[PDB]
From Swiss-Prot, chains A, B:
Name used for this protein in its record: Transient receptor potential cation channel subfamily M member 8
First and last residues shown, out of full length: 1086 to 1104 of 1104
Null mutant phenotype: Trpm8-deficient mice have severe behavioral deficits in response to cold stimuli.
Native source organism of the sequence: Mus musculus (Mouse)
Tissue-level expression: Expressed in dorsal root and trigeminal ganglia. Specifically expressed in a subset of pain- and temperature-sensing neurons. Not expressed in heavily myelinated neurons. Not expressed in neurons expressing TRPA1 or TRPV1.
Quaternary organization: Homotetramer. Interacts (via N-terminus and C-terminus domains) with TCAF1; the interaction stimulates TRPM8 channel activity. Interacts (via N-terminus and C-terminus domains) with TCAF2; the interaction inhibits TRPM8 channel activity.
Function: Non-selective ion channel permeable to monovalent and divalent cations, including Na(+), K(+), and Ca(2+), with higher permeability for Ca(2+). Activated by multiple factors, such as temperature, voltage, pressure, and changes in osmolality. Activated by cool temperatures (<23-28 degrees Celsius) and by chemical ligands evoking a sensation of coolness, such as menthol and icilin, therefore plays a central role in the detection of environmental cold temperatures.
Lineage of origin: Eukaryota, Metazoa, Chordata, Craniata, Vertebrata
Subcellular location: Cell membrane; Membrane raft
Post-translational modification: N-glycosylation is not essential for but facilitates cell surface expression, multimerization, association with lipid rafts and ion channel activity.
Similarity section: Belongs to the transient receptor (TC 1.A.4) family. LTrpC subfamily. TRPM8 sub-subfamily.
Free-text note regarding domains: Cooling agents bind within a pocket formed entirely by the S1-S4 helices that opens to the cytoplasm. The coiled coil region is required for multimerization.
Superkingdom: Eukaryota
Length: 19, 19
């Protein structure tokens, strides 16, 4: 669960990096 | 499970924001 949460946070950061 | 669903929805919204 912690790994999934970390992956979700990383994906959100990557998405925000575009904008 | 609810947190995963919310993360998926947020990722979908971020992806749609690009277009």
């Amino acid at each position: 669960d912690s790994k999934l949460n970390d992956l979700k946070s990383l994906l959100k950061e990557i998405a925000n990096n575009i904008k």
